[PDB]
Amino acid sequence: MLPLSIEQRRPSRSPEYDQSTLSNYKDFAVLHTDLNLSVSFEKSAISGSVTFQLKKLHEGKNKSDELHLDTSYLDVQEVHIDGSKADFQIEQRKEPLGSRLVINNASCNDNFTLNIQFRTTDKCTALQWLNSKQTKGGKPYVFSQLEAIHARSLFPCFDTPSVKSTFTASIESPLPVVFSGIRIEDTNIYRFEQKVPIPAYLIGIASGDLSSAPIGPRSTVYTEPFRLKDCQWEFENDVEKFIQTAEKIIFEYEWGTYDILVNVDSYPYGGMESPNMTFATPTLIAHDRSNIDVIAHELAHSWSGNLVTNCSWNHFWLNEGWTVYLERRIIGAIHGEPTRHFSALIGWSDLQNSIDSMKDPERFSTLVQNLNDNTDPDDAFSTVPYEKGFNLLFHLETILGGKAEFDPFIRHYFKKFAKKSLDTFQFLDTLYEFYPEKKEILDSVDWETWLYKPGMPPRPHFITALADNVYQLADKWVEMAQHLKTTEDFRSEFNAIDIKDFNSNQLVLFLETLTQNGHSNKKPKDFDWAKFPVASRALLDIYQDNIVKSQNAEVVFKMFKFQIFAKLQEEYKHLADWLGTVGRMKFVRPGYRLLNSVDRRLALATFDKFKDTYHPICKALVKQDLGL
Ligand SMILES: N[C@H](CCC(=O)N[C@@H](CS)C(=O)NCC(=O)O)C(=O)O
Ligand SMILES: [Zn+2]
Numbered sequence: 010m011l012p013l014s015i016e017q018r019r020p021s022r023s024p025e026y027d028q029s030t031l032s033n034y035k036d037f038a039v040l041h042t043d044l045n046l047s048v049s050f051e052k053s054a055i056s057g058s059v060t061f062q063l064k065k066l067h068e069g070k071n072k073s074d075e076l077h078l079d080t081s082y083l084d085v086q087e088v089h090i091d092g093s094k095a096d097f098q099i100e101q102r103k104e105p106l107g108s109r110l111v112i113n114n115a116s117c118n119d120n121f122t123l124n125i126q127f128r129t130t131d132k133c134t135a136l137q138w139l140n141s142k143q144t145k146g147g148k149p150y151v152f153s154q155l156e157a158i159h160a161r162s163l164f165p166c167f168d169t170p171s172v173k174s175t176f177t178a179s180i181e182s183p184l185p186v187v188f189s190g191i192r193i194e195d196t197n198i199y200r201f202e203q204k205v206p207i208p209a210y211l212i213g214i215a216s217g218d219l220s221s222a223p224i225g226p227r228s229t230v231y232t233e234p235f236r237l238k239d240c241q242w243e244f245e246n247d248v249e250k251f252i253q254t255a256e257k258i259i260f261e262y263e264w265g266t267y268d269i270l271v272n273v274d275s276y277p278y279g280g281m282e283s284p285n286m287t288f289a290t291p292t293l294i295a296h297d298r299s300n301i302d303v304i305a306h307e308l309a310h311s312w313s314g315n316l317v318t319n320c321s322w323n324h325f326w327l328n329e330g331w332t333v334y335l336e337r338r339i340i341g342a343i344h345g346e347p348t349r350h351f352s353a354l355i356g357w358s359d360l361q362n363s364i365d366s367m368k369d370p371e372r373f374s375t376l377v378q379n380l381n382d383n384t385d386p387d388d389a390f391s392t393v394p395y396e397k398g399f400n401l402l403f404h405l406e407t408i409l410g411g412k413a414e415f416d417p418f419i420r421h422y423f424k425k426f427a428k429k430s431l432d433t434f435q436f437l438d439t440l441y442e443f444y445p446e447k448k449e450i451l452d453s454v455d456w457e458t459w460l461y462k463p464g465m466p467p468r469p470h471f472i473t474a475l476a477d478n479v480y481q482l483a484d485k486w487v488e489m490a491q492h493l494k495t496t497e498d499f500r501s502e503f504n505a506i507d508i509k510d511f512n513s514n515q516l517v518l519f520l521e522t523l524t525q526n527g528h529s530n531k532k533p534k535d536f537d538w539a540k541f542p543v544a545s546r547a548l549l550d551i552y553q554d555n556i557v558k559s560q561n562a563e564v565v566f567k568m569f570k571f572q573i574f575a576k577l578q579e580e581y582k583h584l585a586d587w588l589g590t591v592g593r594m595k596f597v598r599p600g601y602r603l604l605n606s607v608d609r610r611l612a613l614a615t616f617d618k619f620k621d622t623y624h625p626i627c628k629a630l631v632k633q634d635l636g637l
Contacts, residue, residue: 024320048182079161079168081107082132105385135163150217157386160209173206189283215281232271282310289471295561309335350472363392378501480528490544499547521568539573545575
C-alpha cells in the first residue's frame with residue numbers, strides 16, 4: 010500500500026538484515042539462553058559459561074550450514090555442543106564489530122545445545138567497575154552497559170536486537186546481585202529467570218552492597234543501604250500511578266514486576282531500561298519528588314524497545330523515538346497537555362542544537378540510519394532518533410485526528426510486534442494497513458523528508474504556554490536589573506510567587522534563560538549579570554525556597570551556572586564542594602568547566618581533592634579538560 014518514495018528503499022526480506030553483527034543469526038531460532046557467571050572484583054572480570062539451545066532454520070536449497078557468534082575482547086576457553094568438544098576459531102578482530110567466533114558443528118540434529126566457557130578480558134567493554142573509594146557505601150561495585158553492541162564483550166552471543174531469547178541466570182558474587190530478570194528463591198549465588206524473550210543488549214547485571222524496599226504492589230527499589238530509606242520515599246507515591254497510566258494508554262504491563270536500581274554515586278550515565286531492573290542515577294532523589302517524571306522514559310521502554318524491538322541500529326528511532334512519544338503521553342496524562350507540549354518544545358531545541366553541532370549532519374541526522382558493517386553504532390547516537398522520531402509520531406497523531414484516533418493504532422502496533430523485532434518498513438505497512446480509510450491523509454506525509462533527509466523536520470506547532478511563562482519572567486528580570494538599584498526595589502517588583510507554579514523543567518529553563526540574558530532577541534548589547542550583583546543576589550534571595558533550597562540536581566546545577574555567570578565569588582566554594590557529591594558526567598564535567606572559568610586555582614584544587622572518587626572515565630576527561 011506504500012508510496013514509491015519508500016517502496017524503492019524496501020529490502021528483499023524484513024526485518025532488514027543487521028550489518029552490525031558478524032553472527033549468522035538468520036539461521037537459528039534461539040529457544041533459550043542460560044548464563045552461568047561468577048564475579049571477581051579481585052580481577053575485575055566476569056567468568057563462566059553461556060548455554061544456548063538452538064534450532065537450525067532452513068530455507069531454499071543447497072545452503073551453507075554454519076555457526077557464527079559475536080565476541081569483542083573475550084577469552085573463549087572452550088566449546089561444547091551436545092556435551093562434546095567442538096573445534097573452534099576466533100577470527101582476527103576487525104573494527105568496529107569485533108571478533109567472529111566460528112564453531113565447527115559436527116552434529117546431525119537441527120536442535121542442539123551450545124555451551125561456551127569464557128572469561129571477560131581487561132579490555133572488556135561491557136562492564137564498569139568501581140573501587141571502594143568511588144562509592145559512598147564503602148564497598149566496591151560493578152554494573153553492565155550493553156547497548157548497543159557490547160553484549161558480545163560480556164559473553165559470546167548473537168549480538169543483534171533481531172534476536173530475542175528467554176533467559177535464565179546463576180550469578181555468584183561476594184556482594185548481592187541484581188539482573189535484568191526475576192529473582193528465584195550457596196548463600197551468595199543468585200538465580201534469575203526472564204520469561205519474556207529479550208535481546209542481548211538489554212541484559213543487565215549489577216553487584217555491590219545492595220538493599221531492597223517496596224515502592225509499590227509490583228515494584229521494589231534496590232540501592233546502597235544508607236540511601237535505601239530516601240529512595241523508598243521518592244518512588245513510593247508515584248511508581249504505580251505511572252505504570253497504570255502507561256497501561257491505560259497502551260496495554261497491560263507484561264513483565265510482572267517493575268523494579269528500579271539506584272546505582273552508586275559515581276555512576277556517570279543517565280539511565281538504562283533493562284527489563285525487570287531499570288538502572289537509574291542517584292540524582293533522581295530530589296527529596297521533594299520533583300525529578301520522577303523522568304522514570305516515565307525507562308518505563309515506556311517496557312513497550313517501545315523491550316517488548317517491540319528495532320531489528321538493527323539503522324532503525325533505532327522505532328525504539329527511542331516511540332519511547333519519547335509514550336513518555337510524553339504519560340506525563341501529559343498526569344500533568345495535562347500543556348506540560349506534554351512543554352517537554353516537546355524543549356526537545357525541539359535540543360534537536361536543533363544536536364543537528365547544528367554534528368560532524369557530518371548530512372549522514373547522522375537522517376531518521377533512518379545506514380551503518381553497514383563498518384560504522385560504530387555509538388557514532389550514530391544523537392538527539393535525532395529521540396526527537397525527529399518523536400516528532401513524526403506527533404505529526405501522525407495530529408493529522409490522523411488526535412489521541413482518540415491514534416491510540417487504537419498504538420495498541421495494534423505493540424500487540425502485533427510483541428516479543429518480536431521490526432524495521433521501519435514493517436512499521437509503515439502496519440500504519441497503512443490499519444488506516445485504509447486515511448490513505449489520503451498518510452499519502453500527504455512527506456516520507457522522504459521525514460525518514461531519509463537530514464536536518465530539521467517540518468516544524469510543528471506546540472502549546473508554548475509553560476515556556477512563555479518562563480521567558481516572560483526572565484526577560485522582566487534582565488530588564489529590571491538595568492534600572493532598579495536596591496534589594497528592596499527588587500522585592501517590590503518580584504516575589505516568591507512568580508515561580509510558585511514552576512515545574513522542574515521550568516525552573517531549569519528559567520535559570521538557563523537568565524544566563525543567556527533573556528529570551529527576546531532584543532537583548533541588551535553590553536548586558537552581563539556580573540555587572541549587577543544587587544540584582545542577581547536578590548533573584549536568589551527572593552526565589553530562595555524553590556531554587557536555592559532545591560535539592561533537585563538539575564536545578565542545583567543551573568543555580569550554580571547562574572551564580573558563576575553572575576560572578577558571585579562567594580558561591581564558587583559551594584559549587585566546588587558540590588562537585589564532590591555527584592558522579593554524573595552531565596553535572597561533573599560541565600561543573601569543572603564553569604568553575605575553571607572563574608577560579609582556576611579552586612578548580613585544580615577541587616579536582617585534586619576528588620579525582621579518585623569518580624568513575625575513571627569522568628576523571629580522565631575532566632583531568633584533560635583542565636589541561637592536566
Ligand atoms: N540438512 C541438515 C540435516 C543434517 C544432516 O546431514 N543429517 C544427516 C545426519 S548426520 C543425515 O544422515 N541425513 C540423511 C538421512 O537422515 O537419511 C539440516 O537440517 O540442517
Ligand atoms: Zn531510552
